[PDB]
Design a binder for this molecule. Structure first.
Ligand SMILES: CCCCCCCC/C=C\CCCCCCCC(=O)OC[C@H](COP(=O)(O)OCCN)OC(=O)CCCCCCC/C=C\CCCCCCCC
Ligand SMILES: CCCCCCCC/C=C\CCCCCCCC(=O)OC[C@H](COP(=O)(O)OCCN)OC(=O)CCCCCCC/C=C\CCCCCCCC
Ligand code: HEC
Ligand code: HEC
Ligand code: HEM
Ligand code: HEM
Ligand code: HEM
Ligand code: HEM
Ligand SMILES: C[C@@]1(c2ccc(Oc3ccccc3)cc2)OC(=O)N(Nc2ccccc2)C1=O
Ligand SMILES: C[C@@]1(c2ccc(Oc3ccccc3)cc2)OC(=O)N(Nc2ccccc2)C1=O
Ligand SMILES: CCCCCCCCO[C@@H]1O[C@H](CO)[C@@H](O)[C@H](O)[C@H]1O
Ligand SMILES: CCCCCCCCO[C@@H]1O[C@H](CO)[C@@H](O)[C@H](O)[C@H]1O
Ligand SMILES: CCCCCCCCO[C@@H]1O[C@H](CO)[C@@H](O)[C@H](O)[C@H]1O
Ligand SMILES: CCCCCCCCO[C@@H]1O[C@H](CO)[C@@H](O)[C@H](O)[C@H]1O
Ligand SMILES: CCCCCCCCO[C@@H]1O[C@H](CO)[C@@H](O)[C@H](O)[C@H]1O
Ligand SMILES: CCCCCCCCO[C@@H]1O[C@H](CO)[C@@H](O)[C@H](O)[C@H]1O
Lengths: 49, 379, 78, 241, 49, 380, 241, 81
């Protein structure tokens, strides 16, 4: 009983369903000249393309 | 000192309150609610923190942050059920603890008793501000009714209410401050519990026969540690059964609807543990009068120790008082029931009856019968 | 720290057995249940009564409330 | 004045303490919400991903989401644009705000249905009775224009016209789309929408009961075991004399 | 964006240098800038996730 | 039982035995004033904190502005915020001087009082950290990023713990709401552990500047130290109020007046002054895990002090060589503090590693060594 | 590469520990913000009511607010509508989002100015030096198209063209609108915008200093008084025979 | 908790004190106080001051050195054309 209750409570602090819901983002390669670096926020962190 | 359990400045304290503590050999199940109340407190705090870590105190986000908790947080729904129902379990246990106290005249330990009442008052405030947080229709209006009670105070009344609100009505500043209070109060309860048990150890426990147990004491461990752990699991079954098989038996469906400042629910009814008091508040058709009756209905507890006329401590050997005692309990059931009904015949009259008898049993019959019983014993 | 200064006791002997030499829940039928009945009995007419009364007041008041919701045919006779 | 008719208790297959929800029924119920109720009712708290592994497969869920156009942005010009739905999106609101909603329902506001079975006394029993219980007003009772008589709705005059009737849609699983069949399914769906944890809660309750039975017994013994010392203890008073 | 003794990137916090490929060349940084898993709309779009 | 309540009552008895009749050394100096000042910061912080908490909103979209709302709309909200922000600093100034006094006078020989003392420091640190993150400005965000990512240096479980603590894949809203709760809670753990601190302490009562028994000359806490303490309170209260009322922003980073931006990291991320010396140490080791350990050790080294005492005398009062070594250490800390506020570049980098290296050298080698050396010069 | 020019310290009339803000200057400063800076800069945290009793009369403040059209709603149809401003409204944002802002400023984002003097090292000393310090780049330095050389801005190439020049506006109080005069005022205004409590804070600081001087002295005496017992105490060791 | 009475075993020590009202709170400021403040200061300056003086120097240097390295080295463009 202790192992379960403590496990449940512990996990209540790890990524919730909405957060784990992860998608993909499309980026057109015609908006970035040759040499440029564009940053796109994504899954919390910055996405470098 | 030869053994650490006694010399160490910290263990010394654990030993003197949970290991070598002298306890009466004959205390019954009615002496189990003290520890159960302690566990509710630890349980409530622990589940409350876990909920607070996903809660958001803002009228535009309160309701949904709770929804977010129950729907997205791993075991969020479970933790919420345990918290919401734990509050009920807390009141069930506090009421039985109180009953035991009145029956066995535990109130003759005045300081333990008085702090006991402070604890009750504090638990009430806690439950109240906590109940308002989810911000449903019931949370909102209950918060409206309750806070407006204080407006009944003459002169300073309107001023205090608007102050407490942080504006002209229950609104966001009320919610944010209520969250803070709800977070803080439980810890005052924990602290005052220490004072409660500190006064108590000055004399140790009372017992069912109401006669000195110095001739027959036993170490708290393992007698009551084991008995207490047993009592824990016994009460833990209904709690979990309720929370896991009937999560919403005790709640008003109205609180599943976002608070609406413009529409008041048709039948505003408080949580079960406040019904009997609500009933009393309504018995007096006068605003201020009804508030005083409500205040007195709880503060009457500070008066109990002074209405003790019996030459005996408990009611164990007092058959007339025992009847008077169960009448009072039943009287409370009636009030509870009356508090859940609308203000209409026959309820209105039944209510005023029960209200009137409640105070009559405590202020007149109990001391009177106690004196009468003394004479029948030839004292 | 109270054990040792609790009471002045004289001439009392007590006898006990290790918990391993005895039965945890002995004489259930010859002693336990008979006593549960004794205890129940000695209290039922102290407790039950007021609760019975509360129950009645409840039944009545409830039925009376619903009865007053019904239509009184004598209000439309003429 | 305060005359009210309370719904009967239907034997839902999920009413028992260990009774899960009928997922086939929940899947169907979803279609009813999607094809009928969503036209006027929002369900702000459920997203297409919630369907996966419950009533639909991931592939299906994605499809369902893409059927919807959702607003996003701002883009580089600071403009809002439309895009196809993602499983992470919540069900589309029929209106931008209650004002618009009322405006499209004669001043009446169709409530969000995410927690409707818990926000009404009677739960699915009440939602079912209301959906299948429309009828003409009794003698002496007149319903104002725009409202409809329903004995189950408080006041009896509801602003919602009977939403479902026989074959108002076709279950792609071949179930006979009768009015009551439809109500029964959507109601089941509503139960799930309100407490998605319903099933897991009951599986836990089962374990809770078993562990509790066991543990309570063992602890009872141990308490009795330790206390036997005092329970069977005997004493005597032997003064010198 | 475009700074560091390797024409790639430079972290202002403690001075980690990365080349135009995003690899760690100089500084405290233990590994190279993560390469997310990136389905392929031929040419003009990139589905990352 | 007793003729006077001050002694018989079960609650007053406690106040009397710790703040009225408590035996205190007659000669303790101003360095023994920081205990009570620490207690007053604690009560002050809690009070101002609750007051701020009543208008705060833990949500990334509302955090920054709720604080702004507090300073701009709440009657005296601005004042209460200044008192809270600056109170955190006075709290560290006082804890540092309290520790300094402890090391100098060998107060650490009261091992339990000392150890709980270190727990108190650690807890105060956590508290200040989660608290600093709440306003959610640029510095709140990135500092929260740097600090939390320190834990990712732990091998194997590192990444796992960090993402757990975050409640997601980076510092975000669930981090903020859980940080608020922690920030609300911890101060009370501090209060509780303070009781344990003073409880162990009373087992022996205070030490004193000469490091010799004061049993021959003790005095009631009241009115000697109650009056001395109230005086010390108002003396430190002036700078505090002067700073808060005439220079509210002297200690904060202007960067925190800019809403957190996940995509732009400030050019010069610099921690609050009370964390600079430790930060300096963290950077001395150009290896992620190595730097983290140096940081951990820089504080946990305090648990080791009681075992590095070789002197036959308790304090440093009669030990001139140790006194030099002592001020070297203090100056070493200044150097680290200064180094922690500069960019990682020559000559700072080398100066930094020097200071770091000597910090540990003084504590682990020179102090016990010199202590032994001094014993011999005394002919012991 | 690591070169930067730091602004000098101007003798602002509000720099002294007991020096309030010059409200005439703050009033003027506001006009500069309203008529010049607000075209690209937002000031999200200040409302027209904040002006009252500080720089403007209630009647004036109301006028100022009504000059703006603000969005409100939804109305009866769930539609958003426009209305004239109220003193309770906050200053109008020039753009709907930073994307639009950049879009209208060559990719550059003009920051909100509510806390700008506190969000930049140097405060008004820096804002003043930047506004009046534009000049041509030094030999060997080329500014990319769209940017302007400013030695005070880090990197020295700013995306903001010199916003103010002589007589770019007329102070209705007749003050000679010279560039530096305008900068000095708007900067004073910015100080106020960032810390509206500026003045009150300093008045409190005054009292704090007095009460503190007094109280510290009295308590110093009391401590000395009680301790005099031990301070002048004498003792001797008189062992027997 | 309660300690006065069981602290130490003391013999043959006499002490004399006066009420706070019979004496001056801050007496002999010039003949005793300040002279002693000077004594105290003096007996510690060469213990404390030194390391701080050194910290100050290291600070001055390191700061100046940092700024110096920001300056241009004319010998990097002598033969530039
Ligand atoms: C307050 C809010 C009110 C809410 C509703 C109240 C809840 C009502 C549920 C009923 C509670 C169950 C109680 C049934 C117990 C039956 C029973 O055993 O009674 C007889 C039995 C006999 O004991 P002895 O005299 O020692 O004899 C032993 C051998 N010589 O008496 C007892 O158990 C002691 C009485 C303690 C129980 C009190 C609990 C009642 C709770 C209500 C709150 C009342 C107090 C508030 C006062 C203001
Ligand atoms: C940690 C973070 C670091 C942050 C920066 C540190 C702050 C630096 C500000 C300087 C503090 C002011 C101290 C000046 C005191 C000068 C003074 O009087 O020194 C001499 C004087 C002589 O006393 P006695 O030997 O008893 O002789 C009396 C008659 N026989 O010594 C003392 O006052 C005792 C020393 C106590 C002060 C210690 C405070 C220093 C604070 C820094 C933190 C250090 C500890 C951390 C260790 C790891
Ligand atoms: C044309 C729009 C429309 C459709 C389609 C519709 N509803 Fe409604 N619904 C309403 C409106 C309008 C109300 C408001 C009734 C009132 O308060 O007068 C309402 C109210 C309700 C209520 C109960 C309100 C209460 O106070 O108890 C429920 C439950 C409900 N609808 C369920 C459904 C379900 C399930 C469906 C699909 C089978 C459905 N509705 C389809 C318009 C609609
Ligand atoms: C045509 C739009 C426009 C006008 C008018 C304008 N600004 Fe700006 N301002 C900007 C832009 C664009 C930036 C961005 C500069 C950058 O980051 O490259 C900026 C930046 C600033 C900054 C400093 C940014 C920094 O990082 O240090 C301040 C301060 C400022 N402006 C003040 C003012 C004041 C005061 C006025 C009115 C006297 C004013 N601006 C009017 C466009 C303008
Ligand atoms: C937060 C609420 C409370 C907690 C945690 C608590 C806890 C305890 C504990 C652990 C005990 C010892 C065991 C027992 O006899 O039950 C106890 C005893 C007692 N408590 Fe409480 N209590 C609470 C509320 C109250 C209330 C509301 C009252 C009275 C209005 C009260 C009156 C007493 C008294 C008089 C006793 C003496 C028991 C005896 O007769 O031996 N308590 N309580
Ligand atoms: C004496 C112990 C406590 C009692 C009696 C209590 C009671 C309650 C009540 C009545 C509710 C409403 C439940 C509902 O939603 O229907 C509530 C809500 C809440 N409580 Fe407590 N609580 C206690 C302690 C705590 C503590 C210590 C915290 C936090 C550190 C806390 C945090 C919360 C939060 C965040 C909610 C809102 C979420 C929710 O409504 O489920 N509670 N509490
Ligand atoms: C929340 C933090 C703290 C509070 C509130 C606190 C409070 C106190 C109090 C009131 C005293 C008695 C008066 C005095 O001598 O100053 C004391 C003494 C002491 N504290 Fe703390 N303290 C704190 C932190 C610490 C720390 C960080 C250490 C050590 C790392 C520490 C070590 C001690 C020791 C050893 C004494 C003995 C003093 C003597 O030599 O007589 N304390 N503390
Ligand atoms: C040990 C005592 C405490 C310390 C060291 C402390 C420290 C801090 C720090 C460093 C900040 C950030 C100040 C800033 O805005 O720059 C902060 C913020 C905050 N603290 Fe505390 N705090 C303490 C106790 C509390 C308590 C008890 C509460 C609440 C019951 C609290 C509530 C807050 C709130 C709401 C903020 C946000 C508003 C703001 O940033 O000004 N604090 N605290
Ligand atoms: C849980 C509950 C509650 C808890 C304790 C109470 O006791 C009091 C607390 C403070 C002041 C007076 C009574 C009262 C209500 O809080 C709350 O909003 N309600 N709901 C409610 C509904 C209608 C009228 C009055 C209240 C409670 O029952
Ligand atoms: C106030 C402050 C802080 C406070 C106590 C600390 O001590 C610790 C607390 C927990 C864990 C490790 C250290 C560290 C930082 O919180 C915070 O975000 N910062 N800012 C910061 C900036 C750059 C790098 C690291 C931190 C602090 O200074
Ligand atoms: C005394 C009561 C003890 C309660 C023990 C019951 C343990 C709950 O068991 C739970 O069952 C769920 C459903 O399968 C799982 O998803 C959880 O991970 C598991 O911990
Ligand atoms: C660990 C469980 C503690 C429960 C709290 C009981 C109170 O309080 C009392 O203070 C005395 C003096 O400090 C101690 O000697 C006693 O042991 C302690 O019970
Ligand atoms: C890396 C380890 C991954 C383990 C995935 C944990 C998935 C938890 O799965 C759980 O199973 C229970 C029993 O069927 C269900 O009742 C819960 O709703 C479900 O979330
Ligand atoms: C009022 C706060 C006093 C400090 C707490 C000390 C309590 C522990 O002190 C012990 O009991 C002696
Ligand atoms: C910085 C802009 C200041 C404009 C107000 C001038 C009055 C300053 O003065 C102070 O203002 C406070 C708040 O208004 C009052 O509470 C104080 O009593 C008052 O003295
Ligand atoms: C040692 C602590 C001394 C605190 C005394 C400071 C009292 C300042 O008092 C404040 O002065 C302001 C200036 O007009 C007023 O606006 C405030 O209302 C008033 O409370």
């Amino acid at each position: 009983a202790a192992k379960n209750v403590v496990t449940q409570f512990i996990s209540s602090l790890s990524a919730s369903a909405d957060v784990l819901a992860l998608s993909k983002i499309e980026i057109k390669l015609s908006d970035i000249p040759e040499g440029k670096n564009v940053a796109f926020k994504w899954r919390g962190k910055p996405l470098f393309v | 000192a030869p053994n650490i359990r006694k010399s160490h400045p910290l263990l010394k304290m654990i030993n003197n309150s949970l290991i070598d503590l002298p306890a009466p050999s004959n205390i019954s199940a009615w002496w189990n609610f003290g520890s159960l109340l302690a566990v509710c407190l630890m349980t409530q705090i622990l589940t409350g923190l876990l909920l607070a870590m996903h809660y958001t105190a803002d009228t535009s986000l309160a309701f949904s942050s709770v929804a977010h908790t129950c729907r997205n947080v791993q075991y969020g729904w479970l933790i919420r059920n345990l918290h919401a129902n734990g509050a009920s379990f807390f009141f069930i246990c506090i009421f039985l603890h109180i009953g035991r106290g009145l029956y066995y005249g535990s109130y003759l330990y005045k300081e333990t008793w008085n702090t006991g009442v402070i604890l009750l008052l504090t638990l009430m405030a806690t439950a109240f501000v906590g109940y308002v947080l989810p911000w449903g229709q019931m949370s909102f209006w209950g918060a409206t009714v309750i806070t407006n009670l204080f407006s009944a105070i003459p002169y300073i009344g309107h001023t205090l209410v608007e102050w407490a609100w942080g504006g002209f009505s229950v609104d966001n500043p009320t919610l944010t401050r209520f969250f803070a209070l709800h977070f803080l109060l439980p810890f005052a309860i924990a602290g005052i519990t220490i004072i409660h048990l500190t006064f108590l150890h000055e004399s140790g426990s009372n017992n069912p026969l109401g006669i000195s147990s110095d001739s027959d004491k036993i170490p708290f461990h393992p007698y009551y540690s084991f008995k207490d752990i047993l009592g824990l699991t016994l009460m833990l079954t209904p709690f979990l059964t309720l929370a896991l098989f009937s999560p919403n038996l005790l709640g008003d469906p109205e609180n599943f609807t976002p608070a609406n400042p413009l529409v008041t629910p048709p039948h505003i009814k408080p949580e079960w543990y406040f019904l009997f008091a609500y009933a009393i508040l309504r018995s007096i058709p006068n605003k201020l009068g009804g508030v005083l009756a409500l205040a007195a209905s709880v503060l009457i507890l500070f008066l109990i120790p002074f209405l003790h006329k019996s030459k005996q401590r408990t009611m164990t050997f007092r058959p007339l008082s025992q009847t008077l005692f169960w009448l009072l309990v039943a009287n409370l059931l009636i009030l509870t029931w009356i508090g859940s009904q609308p203000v209409e015949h026959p309820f209105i009259i039944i209510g005023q009856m029960a209200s009137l008898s409640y105070f009559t049993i405590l202020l007149i019959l109990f001391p009177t019968i106690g004196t009468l019983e003394n004479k029948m014993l030839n004292y | 720290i109270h054990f040792g200064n609790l009471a002045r006791v004289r001439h009392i002997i007590t006898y006990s057995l290790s918990p391993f030499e005895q039965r945890a829940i002995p004489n259930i039928f010859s002693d336990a249940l008979p006593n549960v009945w004794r205890r129940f009995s000695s209290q039922v007419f102290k407790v039950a009564p007021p609760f019975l009364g509360a129950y009645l007041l409840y039944s009545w008041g409830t039925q009376e409330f619903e009865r007053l919701k019904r239509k009184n045919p004598a209000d439309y006779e003429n | 004045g305060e005359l009210e008719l309370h719904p009967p208790a239907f034997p839902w297959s999920h009413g028992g303490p260990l009774s899960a929800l009928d997922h086939s029924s929940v899947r169907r119920g979803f279609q009813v919400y999607k094809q009928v109720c969503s036209a006027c009712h929002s369900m702000d708290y459920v997203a297409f991903r919630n369907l996966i592994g419950v009533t639909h497969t991931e592939a299906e869920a994605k499809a369902l989401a893409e059927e919807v156009e959702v607003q996003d942005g701002p883009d580089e010009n600071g403009e809002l644009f439309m895009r196809p739905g993602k499983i992470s999106d919540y069900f589309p609101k029929p209106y931008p705000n209650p004002e618009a909603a009322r405006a499209a329902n004669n001043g009446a506001l169709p409530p969000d249905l995410s927690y409707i079975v818990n926000a009404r006394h009677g739960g699915e029993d009440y939602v079912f009775s209301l959906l299948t219980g429309y009828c003409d007003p009794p003698a002496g009772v007149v319903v104002r224009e725009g409202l409809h008589y329903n004995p189950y709705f408080p006041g009896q005059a509801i602003g919602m016209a009977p939403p479902i009737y026989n074959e108002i849609l076709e279950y792609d699983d071949g179930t006979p789309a009768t009015m009551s069949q439809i109500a029964k399914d959507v109601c089941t769906f509503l139960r799930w929408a309100a407490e998605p944890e319903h099933d897991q809660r009951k599986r836990m309750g089962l374990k809770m009961l078993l562990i509790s039975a066991l543990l309570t017994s063992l602890l009872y013994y141990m308490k009795r075991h330790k206390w036997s010392v005092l329970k069977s203890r005997k004493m005597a008073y032997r003064p010198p004399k | 964006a475009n700074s560091g003794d390797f024409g790639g990137y430079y972290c202002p916090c403690h001075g980690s240098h990365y080349d135009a490929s995003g690899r760690i060349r100089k500084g405290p940084a233990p590994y190279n800038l993560e390469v997310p898993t990136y389905q392929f709309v031929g040419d003009d779009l990139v589905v990352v996730g």
